[PDB]
Curated annotation (Swiss-Prot), chain B:
<comment type="function">
    <text>Subunit of the fusion protein that is processed upon entry into the host cell. Mediates fusion of the virion and cellular membranes by functioning as a class I viral fusion protein. Contains a viral fusion peptide that is unmasked after S2 cleavage. This cleavage can occur at the cell membrane by host TMPRSS2 or during endocytosis by host CSTL. In either case, this triggers an extensive and irreversible conformational change that leads to fusion of the viral envelope with the cellular cytoplasmic membrane, releasing viral genomic RNA into the host cell cytoplasm.</text>
</comment>
<protein>
    <recommendedName>
        <fullName>Spike protein S2'</fullName>
    </recommendedName>
</protein>
Length: 64, 49
């Protein structure tokens, strides 16, 4: 997913959507969660990966 | 993938299937996602011999 011109990859799980929202989950059981900056890591710019998507990532507590 | 060995088959795109196997030996996902064309070409040229 692309947020602010950067690419974010999951830490342990996959990205899924029910049609209107995006979550993360483990690969062997259904247990959604809201994407934050704690369960993902960033690397590179946003013009290489194929199939990237536009969404938003929420900062847990530092700025709020 | 390996999900059809025990249970019922579950669909998954191939490119996301190779990332699992890359993570299974120690490398990270962005390495595969940033070198897709080169790896595909290498596989094709290796299997064509």
């Amino acid at each position: 997913i692309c947020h602010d011109g950067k690419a974010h990859f999951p830490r342990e799980g996959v990205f899924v959507s029910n049609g209107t929202h995006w979550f993360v989950t483990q690969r062997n059981f259904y247990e959604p969660q809201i994407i934050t900056t704690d369960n993902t890591f960033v690397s590179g710019n946003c013009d290489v990966v194929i199939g990237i998507v536009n969404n938003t990532v929420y900062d847990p507590l530092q700025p709020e | 993938g390996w999900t059809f060995g025990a249970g019922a088959a579950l669909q998954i795109p191939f490119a996301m299937q190779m990332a699992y196997r890359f993570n299974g030996i120690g490398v990270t996902q962005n390495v595969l996602y940033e070198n897709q064309k080169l790896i595909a070409n290498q596989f094709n040229s290796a299997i064509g011999k």
